[PDB]
């Protein structure tokens, strides 16, 4: 696992700061912040307005989020710079108190990438609550060879990618801070997720790995977005946030919580918006960046994926 000083940011501080917003507060002075990291093809508000923004507010947090441009489609390594910068700012702005990080989709990959390669934030994050994280990427678009022109982060989230290779070899498939991963065997975006074991893309060693169907049975169906928004997901997430251990507790959730519909506490309007969470991604991609190669790894990540192919060529020693 990488140690010592943080790698330098490729983006200017002003650019990174511009990507961070808190509800009714500035990052420099915020009470009980929670950092929300969005999914591929979305901004922070698009990922969370219908769900964790109001839900974390009702639990006593000030929700904050990053919106790396354009819509999380750029290089995941750059998206991570936004998160690392945000944690540094929010830790300082809350009186040097650790804060929780809650994520959806790529957001979890970003969080774990940050924790793997930027040691400074390990003492600033008290827990990670990741919904449908794709630490191994996904196999559903097929192999990297044969991918059509795609967004930078879509390359990186393809199973076999240089990015996912580097994360694994650097020790990033083991939890770094107390982590809960809530995911679904019926995820239509991220696979494989079916085994309820370390094979699953959402699994971290030593983490609290909660495949919904392991608790709820074979008839429980939630998709990629439902993994974030469901009532079951809320109970698990609430457990993780409140836990003195930093992970969700089995005593806090069971079969009686196996409601696949959006969280009960959301307004009817919020439930509808939550159900339609995937919608904005479609427009985002069409107008979004596309290329025929995976972005180069940053120098800090290269020793963990020698021999993998990126835009400049094969990663050399």
| Reduced DSSP (H G I as helix, E B as strand, rest coil) percent helix, strand, coil of the chain, to 5 | 35, 15, 50
Q: Name which of 175, 85, 59 is nearest 127 in CA terms.
A: 175
HSE toward the beta carbon, residue 9, CA cutoff 13 A: 18
Measure CA 59 to chain center.
20
The method of structure determination was X-ray
- What is the DSSP secondary structure assignment for residue 184, as one 8-state letter? -
What six digits make up the tokens of 152?
């930078």
Angle at 279 between CA 278 and CA 280, to 5 degrees: 100
Number of domains comprising the chain:
1
Rounded distance between C-alpha atoms, residue 151 and residue 289, angstroms? 5
Resolution to one decimal, Å? 1.5
Known catalytic membership, residue 224: yes
Specify whether the CB–CB gap between 233 and 227 falls below 8 A.
yes
Rounded distance between C-alpha atoms, residue 156 and residue 295, angstroms? 8
CA distances, 166 to each of 26, 95, 315 (Å)? 34, 34, 11
Catalytic residue among 187, 201, 227, 233: 187
Structural domain of 86: 1-317
Does the N-terminal peptide bond of residue 70 adopt cis geometry, omega within 30 degrees of 0? yes
Q: Name which of 257, 240, 231, 79 is nearest 175 in CA terms.
A: 240
Rounded distance between C-alpha atoms, residue 48 and residue 200, angstroms? 24
Helices (H), the chain: 13-18, 44-48, 52-58, 76-93, 106-117, 152-156, 162-169, 212-216, 226-229, 231-242, 268-275, 279-286
Rounded distance between C-alpha atoms, residue 136 and residue 111, angstroms? 14
Write out the H or E segment, with its range, that includes residue 100: strand 99-104
Rounded distance between C-alpha atoms, residue 181 and residue 187, angstroms? 14
Rounded distance between C-alpha atoms, residue 116 and residue 109, angstroms? 10
Known catalytic membership, residue 3: no
Q: How many CB atoms lie within 10 A of CB 205?
A: 11
Q: Name which of 60, 50, 37, 32 is nearest 131 in CA terms.
A: 37
Angle between helices 162-169 and 106-117 (to 10 degrees): 50
What six digits make up the tokens of 290?
């596309």
Rounded distance between C-alpha atoms, residue 95 and residue 31, angstroms? 9
Residue 317, SS3?
Answer: coil
* Sheet order of strands, 125-131 included: 20-22, 62-66, 33-37, 99-104, 125-131, 179-183, 208-211
DSSP-assigned letters across all residues of 28-84: TB-SSEEEEEPPTT--HHHHHTTTHHHHHHHTT-EEEEE--TTTT-S-HHHHHHHHH
Residue 310, SS3?
Answer: strand
Rounded distance between C-alpha atoms, residue 127 and residue 49, angstroms? 21
Rounded distance between C-alpha atoms, residue 167 and residue 115, angstroms? 10
- What is the DSSP secondary structure assignment for residue 99, as one 8-state letter? E
Instruction: Give the CATH number of the domain where residue 212 resides.
Output: 3.40.50.1820
Known catalytic membership, residue 250: no
Catalytic residue among 200, 224, 233, 239: 224
Q: Name which of 158, 189, 168, 154 is nearest 288 in CA terms.
A: 154
Q: Name which of 102, 72, 77, 73 is nearest 87 in CA terms.
A: 102
Catalytic residue among 105, 201, 233, 239: 105
């Amino acid at each position: 696992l990488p140690s010592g000083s943080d790698p330098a940011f490729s983006q200017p501080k002003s650019v990174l700061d511009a990507g961070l917003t808190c509800q009714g507060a500035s990052p420099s002075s915020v009470s009980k912040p929670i950092l929300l990291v969005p999914g591929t093809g979305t901004t922070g508000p698009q990922s969370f307005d219908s769900n964790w923004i109001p839900l974390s507010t009702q639990l006593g947090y000030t929700p904050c989020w990053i919106s790396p441009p354009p819509f999380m489609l750029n290089d995941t390594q750059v998206n991570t710079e936004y998160m690392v910068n945000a944690i540094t700012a929010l830790y300082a702005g809350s009186g040097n108190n650790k804060l929780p990080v809650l994520t959806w989709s790529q957001g979890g990959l970003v969080a774990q990438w940050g924790l793997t390669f930027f040691p400074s934030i390990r003492s600033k994050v008290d827990r990670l609550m990741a919904f449908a994280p794709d630490y191994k990427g996904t196999v559903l678009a097929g192999p990297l060879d044969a991918l059509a022109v795609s967004a930078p982060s879509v390359w990186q989230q393809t199973t076999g990618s240089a990015l996912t290779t580097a994360l694994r070899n650097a020790g990033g498939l083991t939890q770094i801070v107390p982590t809960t991963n809530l995911y679904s065997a019926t995820d239509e975006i991220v696979q494989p997720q079916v085994s309820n074991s370390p094979l699953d893309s959402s699994y971290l060693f030593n983490g609290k790995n909660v495949q919904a169907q392991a608790v709820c049975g074979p008839l429980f169906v939630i998709g990629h977005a439902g993994s974030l928004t469901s009532q079951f997901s809320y109970v698990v997430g609430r457990s993780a946030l409140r836990s003195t251990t930093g992970q969700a507790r089995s005593a806090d959730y069971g079969i009686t919580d196996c409601n696949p519909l959006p969280a009960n506490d959301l307004t009817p309007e919020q439930k509808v918006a939550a159900a339609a969470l995937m919608a904005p991604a479609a427009a985002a991609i069409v107008a979004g960046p596309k290329q025929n190669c995976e972005p180069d790894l940053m120098p800090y990540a290269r020793p963990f994926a020698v021999g993998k192919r990126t835009c400049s060529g094969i990663v050399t020693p």
